[PDB]
Structures are given as C-alpha cells and as structure tokens.
Amino acid sequence: NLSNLHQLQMLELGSNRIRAIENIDTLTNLESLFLGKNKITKLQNLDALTNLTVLSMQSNRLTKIEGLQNLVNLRELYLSHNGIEVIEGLENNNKLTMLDIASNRIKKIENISHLTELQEFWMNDNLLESWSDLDELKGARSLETVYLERNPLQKDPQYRRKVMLALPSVRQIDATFVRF
Amino acid sequence: MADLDKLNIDSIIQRLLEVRGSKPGKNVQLQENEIRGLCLKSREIFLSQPILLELEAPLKICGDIHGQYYDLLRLFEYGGFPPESNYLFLGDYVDRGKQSLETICLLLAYKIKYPENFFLLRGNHECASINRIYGFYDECKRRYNIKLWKTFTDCFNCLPIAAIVDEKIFCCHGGLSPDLQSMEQIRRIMRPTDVPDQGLLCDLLWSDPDKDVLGWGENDRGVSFTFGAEVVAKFLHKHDLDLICRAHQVVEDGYEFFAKRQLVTLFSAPNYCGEFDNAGAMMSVDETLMCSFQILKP
Amino acid sequence: FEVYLKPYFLEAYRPIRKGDIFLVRGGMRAVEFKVVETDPSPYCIVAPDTVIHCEGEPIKREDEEESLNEVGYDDIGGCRKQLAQIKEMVELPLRHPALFKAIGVKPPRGILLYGPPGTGKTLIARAVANETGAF
Amino acid sequence: FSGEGQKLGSL
Incomplete structure (x- = not known):
C-alpha cells in the first residue's frame, strides 16, 4: 500500500520482515527521498527521481543501486552502504553540498577537485583506497566536513597532525572538527 | 559538568521531573557545541572508570528500564531521584521508543554532577x-x-x-558466562567495548541466568552462551561471589530470585510490547548488602 | 603545565627525546619543562593517549649549565694526530668493530698520554668522556 | 619526582 500519492512529502515504511517493495518510484511530486534501510537485496527504481533535492539511502541492503545519474539536480545525496562501486550523477547533479562514500572502492573521488561546493565529503571506514581522492579534496577550499576515514595511514600521530595542517579549509575533520 | 553543561544538566533534570509521573517519550535535546562538549566530557568520564565498577551502598538499583522515560521517572520518584540516591541499572537501559534518550541524558547528567549516585548498563x-x-x-x-x-x-x-555492590552482588545484565575467567582481564578491557554475539560479555548482555546447562550452552539470543547453574556456582565459589543481577527478559513478576536467591532477575520492563505484560521491579540494595525486591507497575 | 601547555602535548604528536627541556609560553612567561623520563624509548610520541607522568620537581639551572658545559675542541688546537689516534682506538674500534675483526687484531687497550697535564690534558680526558658513550 | 603516580593533566 505504498504505490503512489498526489500530495506527499514524507514516506517511511521500511524495516519490514518481508523484502517487498511495490511502486517505489511512481510519484514525481516529492522533494526529499529517504530510501535507506531497504530490506530488498536490490533497489527497485532510482532513475525516476529527477526532482528530489535530498537523497538518503544509508544502511540499505539494496546492493544494486543504479539510475543515480538520471537526476537533473539534487542538493543532498547520501549513498552510504549502497552497494554501488562508483557514484553516478556527480557530473549531472554537481550542486550537492554533501557527499557520502562509506568506504568507497574507488581509489580517487569522482571530480572532487572541480567540486568546490560539497561541504560534506565523508568517506567512512576507508582502507583507504588511495590518496588521489585526498589530493582532490585538498585542492578545493569550500568543504566543511571531510572524513578520510579510519585509514591505514593514521598509525603515526605525526601523520594526523600533518593532515590537519595541510587541510585547513575543511571546517570539520571526520570525527574531531578541524580547528581551521 | 561544565558551566553550560551543568546548566543543561539542571534543565534536563527539571524537564524530566516535569515529565515525571506522566506519559513517556521525553528527548531532552541540547545545542550543537554544548552537546559536543558534554558528549566529550561524558566519554572521558565514563572511560576514566574501569570496566568493573563498585556500587556505593545503600542504593536503589532498578531492573531493565527498556528505555522508558516514565519508568525511569517513577524509579527516581520512588527509589530516589539523582543525586539523592545511587542508581545502577542491570541492563537493557535503552530500547525501542523515543524515551531512552531522556534516561541516558539524565544518567549522564547525574554522573557529571555525582558519579557515585549514577550508573547504568546495557543488555x-x-x-x-x-x-x-x-x-x-x-x-x-x-x-x-x-x-x-x-x-x-x-x-x-x-x-x-559491570558493577559490584560491596563485592556481594554482581550487577550483570543477564546470566553468567563460561568465557569470563577473572577480573584482571575485565579491568584490562578498557574503552571501547560492545555487547557481542558469543563469549563472556555477550552472555552477560544477551543471555540470561541459565539452569538447563551446566558449563555452557545456547542462549535466547541464539549465539550467546547462557552459562548454566553449575557454571554460575563455580564462578561464584572461585570469585567469592554471592549474587548476580539478571535483566533483558520479560519477567512476569519483575524481580525473580534465581539460583537460590543468588540471581535476582530484576526487570523494570512494564508491559513489554503490550502483549507481554511483564512486571517492573527494582533491586533495593541497602547499606549492609541487603537485596530487596522493589516491584513496580507492569 | 596542564593549564599552560595543555594542547602542546595532547594529540600533538610530540616525539621528543627522554631528557629534553623545551620552553613553553605559559602564564605570560616561558616555562621550560625537562623530560624527566619516558616509559617508551627516548624519542616517544607524546600524545593525549600518552600518560605524561608529572611531579613537582623543578629543575635548577645548574644542571642546565652542566649540560651546556659540553666538552669538545675549545682549548685544543693542532692535536689532530693524537685525537685521530684516540678516535680510531675508540670510534673505529666501536663504529667499525667488524673492521677490527677482519683485521684479525685488537687495537691497543693500553694507551698512555704523556705531556704537560692540565694544559688541556684534563680537558682532553673530559672531551673523551663527553664524546665517549661507553662507561 | 615520580612516574605514573600522580593524576596527570587530562585533556
């Protein structure tokens, strides 16, 4: 009983014992999307959301998540534990002030140096994959929240201080906010 | 705690008292920088104490509040609100609902104002x-x-x-465990920590005081090791222990004395999930290690 | 110390040798705290996790002068051959003990220093001891 | 002078 609605703004009917989704992308009048905690092993449809300015798909068991590049614009987009190897829509929806990688398998970030608008560049529980994403993030200066995060290069306490000194433009540094 | 933190603590205490005796679901939110500082101070203070705490007798230890603001407020009104009385929850202090946040904030505020009159545990x-x-x-x-x-x-x-009441009663979440050996490795296990699926702390938080087993076995969580009567007896004999607290279960009587009044399964969960009308209770520990069954509403 | 150089050591990655004194700008002054000891090796990364044991022992400037009272080539000029012989009998003996082993012969354990003493002779011994790391 | 005997300057 979650097919469609005319005047709807908030919807949350997840955490069901049965992984059944019926018409999850039927309406087109929504502005904020919260598709996280999906019990289905894959997402139903995400390319139809072209007018939503907020995307939340955190802690979702939907391993297959496609259609992220079909959105014209999205101010917020959360892709934590989305099961997607790469983040789509970075070039299309480049007006996002927040970005979630959540231990992204990608070595570098998809156009982070040219992304001078994302103030929340979070990559939680990173290995890390590579330092190219770090260099791309350090190239910009309009970021506030930056998460590396919990990578293998943090063993030396001097490395943390050097990283903090190198990136003063980020208002917050993962857990402990950067003094800036 | 800090001036802003202490002011927020007093405000939260007043809000909980005004929400005391009424329906549950209090939240007790705060600012951004103030809440960040309060959380940092609370983490530092809680990590400062060892894993095995010691209770200050007398105290009014409650069962499993199950994250209920109304139940916590009733316990504060009856068993003694902080810091006027020492509170030590056995476990399952947070659960489904929007009322566990208020209880957690009240416990943190009481610990900041008086760490010897505030304590809680998880199951x-x-x-x-x-x-x-x-x-x-x-x-x-x-x-x-x-x-x-x-x-x-x-x-x-x-x-x-964990916590202990004058080295007489163990304030555990559930039952005994076969993986727990002594307190040397317990005090050595500092922050961070969590309730596992199997082991010793896992059996304490998830499993309950078992009697169908002797040394170890399956538990209600399905992975926990609910140590039987023989394991609990051996642990008590080796460690000179007498009582162990049990929670995280739907108790029809609230406080159940098991292992011949050696496992006071005090549970403060009133009307668990509505259908299971579990009773509420508390363990009123006097100054002379006198464990009393302070039952409450279901 | 805790109220002046609080962040100077807390999560500051301070890998200073055990025995160093650094002046810290605290209380409208420059308070120097000498590293009394370290449970870890000399160069230990002083972080917030590092438990900096601290007592109320104030270090007098006499030890500061004594440490500043090092011994080198300040009144010795031209004794290059003797200094080189001593260093070879010590440094080359130590820094290149394998060189002696391959040479198949030990150096001279008994070396005599003739001359007008105290003209730098006592100074020579002091310079040796300051340079020498052995007992 | 003592090591790990006084309460230290916690941050």
Whole structure:
C-alpha cells in the first residue's frame, strides 16, 4: 500500500520482515527521498527521481543501486552502504553540498577537485583506497566536513597532525572538527 | 559538568521531573557545541572508570528500564531521584521508543554532577548495534544527523561494563558466562567495548541466568552462551561471589530470585510490547548488602 | 603545565627525546619543562593517549649549565694526530668493530698520554668522556 | 619526582 500519492512529502515504511517493495518510484511530486534501510537485496527504481533535492539511502541492503545519474539536480545525496562501486550523477547533479562514500572502492573521488561546493565529503571506514581522492579534496577550499576515514595511514600521530595542517579549509575533520 | 553543561544538566533534570509521573517519550535535546562538549566530557568520564565498577551502598538499583522515560521517572520518584540516591541499572537501559534518550541524558547528567549516585548498563535490548538494539541507532538516524549519532556511539563505547555492590552482588545484565575467567582481564578491557554475539560479555548482555546447562550452552539470543547453574556456582565459589543481577527478559513478576536467591532477575520492563505484560521491579540494595525486591507497575 | 601547555602535548604528536627541556609560553612567561623520563624509548610520541607522568620537581639551572658545559675542541688546537689516534682506538674500534675483526687484531687497550697535564690534558680526558658513550 | 603516580593533566 505504498504505490503512489498526489500530495506527499514524507514516506517511511521500511524495516519490514518481508523484502517487498511495490511502486517505489511512481510519484514525481516529492522533494526529499529517504530510501535507506531497504530490506530488498536490490533497489527497485532510482532513475525516476529527477526532482528530489535530498537523497538518503544509508544502511540499505539494496546492493544494486543504479539510475543515480538520471537526476537533473539534487542538493543532498547520501549513498552510504549502497552497494554501488562508483557514484553516478556527480557530473549531472554537481550542486550537492554533501557527499557520502562509506568506504568507497574507488581509489580517487569522482571530480572532487572541480567540486568546490560539497561541504560534506565523508568517506567512512576507508582502507583507504588511495590518496588521489585526498589530493582532490585538498585542492578545493569550500568543504566543511571531510572524513578520510579510519585509514591505514593514521598509525603515526605525526601523520594526523600533518593532515590537519595541510587541510585547513575543511571546517570539520571526520570525527574531531578541524580547528581551521 | 561544565558551566553550560551543568546548566543543561539542571534543565534536563527539571524537564524530566516535569515529565515525571506522566506519559513517556521525553528527548531532552541540547545545542550543537554544548552537546559536543558534554558528549566529550561524558566519554572521558565514563572511560576514566574501569570496566568493573563498585556500587556505593545503600542504593536503589532498578531492573531493565527498556528505555522508558516514565519508568525511569517513577524509579527516581520512588527509589530516589539523582543525586539523592545511587542508581545502577542491570541492563537493557535503552530500547525501542523515543524515551531512552531522556534516561541516558539524565544518567549522564547525574554522573557529571555525582558519579557515585549514577550508573547504568546495557543488555540484549540496549546493545550498541542496531542488529540487537535498533531503538537507539534507528531513532538517532530518523531524528538527528549522522555526526551526533557517531558521537553518541563513541561515548557509549567509552563507557564501563559491570558493577559490584560491596563485592556481594554482581550487577550483570543477564546470566553468567563460561568465557569470563577473572577480573584482571575485565579491568584490562578498557574503552571501547560492545555487547557481542558469543563469549563472556555477550552472555552477560544477551543471555540470561541459565539452569538447563551446566558449563555452557545456547542462549535466547541464539549465539550467546547462557552459562548454566553449575557454571554460575563455580564462578561464584572461585570469585567469592554471592549474587548476580539478571535483566533483558520479560519477567512476569519483575524481580525473580534465581539460583537460590543468588540471581535476582530484576526487570523494570512494564508491559513489554503490550502483549507481554511483564512486571517492573527494582533491586533495593541497602547499606549492609541487603537485596530487596522493589516491584513496580507492569 | 596542564593549564599552560595543555594542547602542546595532547594529540600533538610530540616525539621528543627522554631528557629534553623545551620552553613553553605559559602564564605570560616561558616555562621550560625537562623530560624527566619516558616509559617508551627516548624519542616517544607524546600524545593525549600518552600518560605524561608529572611531579613537582623543578629543575635548577645548574644542571642546565652542566649540560651546556659540553666538552669538545675549545682549548685544543693542532692535536689532530693524537685525537685521530684516540678516535680510531675508540670510534673505529666501536663504529667499525667488524673492521677490527677482519683485521684479525685488537687495537691497543693500553694507551698512555704523556705531556704537560692540565694544559688541556684534563680537558682532553673530559672531551673523551663527553664524546665517549661507553662507561 | 615520580612516574605514573600522580593524576596527570587530562585533556
């Protein structure tokens, strides 16, 4: 009983014992999307959301998540534990002030140096994959929240201080906010 | 705690008292920088104490509040509100609903104002993970953002584990365990920590006091090792222990004395999930290690 | 110390040798705290996790002068051959003990220093001891 | 002078 609605703004009917989704992308009048905690092993449809300015798909068991590049614009987009190897829509929806990688398998970030608008560049529980994403993030200066995060290069306490000194433009540094 | 932190603590205490005797569901929110500082101070203070705490007799130890603001307020009104009385929850202090946050904030404020009059523990229902306890992680995700949720998770992981009442009664969440050997490795296990699926702390938080086993076996969580009567007896004989607290279960009588009044299964869970009309109770520990069954509403 | 150089050591990655004194600008002054000891090796990364044991022992400037009272080539000029012989009998003996082993012969354990003493002779011994790391 | 005997300057 979650097919469609005319005047709807908030919807949350997840955490069901049965992984059944019926018409999850039927309406087109929504502005904020919260598709996280999906019990289905894959997402139903995400390319139809072209007018939503907020995307939340955190802690979702939907391993297959496609259609992220079909959105014209999205101010917020959360892709934590989305099961997607790469983040789509970075070039299309480049007006996002927040970005979630959540231990992204990608070595570098998809156009982070040219992304001078994302103030929340979070990559939680990173290995890390590579330092190219770090260099791309350090190239910009309009970021506030930056998460590396919990990578293998943090063993030396001097490395943390050097990283903090190198990136003063980020208002917050993962857990402990950067003094800036 | 700090001037802003102490002012917020007093405001939260007043709000809880004004919400005392009424329906549950209090939240007790705060500012951004003030809440960050309060969380940092609480994490530092909780990590400062060892995993094995010691209770200050006399005290009014409650059962499993199950994250109920009304139940916690009733316990404060009857058993003694903080810091006028020492409170020590056995476990399952947070659960489904929007009322565990108020109880956690009140406990943290009481510990900041008086650490010798505030204590709480977690069980199968108050675990740090949404797999066993989603009454905190999902609630924070729905209400608040992810940074505050991460800060709260870190502060909770930076908390103690067990407590003892004059080395007489063990304030455990559930039953005994076959993996727990002595207190040397317990005090050595500092922050961070969490309730596992199997082991010793896992059996304490998820499993309950078992009698169908002797040394070890399966538990109600399905992975925990609910140590039987023989294991609990051997642990008590080796460690000179006499009583162990049990919670995280739907108790029809609230406080059940097991192992011949050696496992006071005090549970403060009133009307668990509505259908299971579990009774509420508390363990009134006097100054002379006198454990009394302070039953409450169901 | 805790109220002046609080962040100077807390999560500050301070890998200073055990025995160093650094002046810290605290309380409208420059308070120097000498590293009394370290449970870890000399160069230990002083972080907030590092438990900096601290007592109320104030270090007098006499030890500061004594440490500043090092011994080198300040009144010795031209004794290059003797200094080189001593260093070879010590440094080359130590820094290149394998060189002696391959040479198949030990150096001279008994070396005599003739001359007008105290003209730098006592100074020579002091310079040796300051340079020498052995007992 | 003592090591790990006084309460230290906690941060």
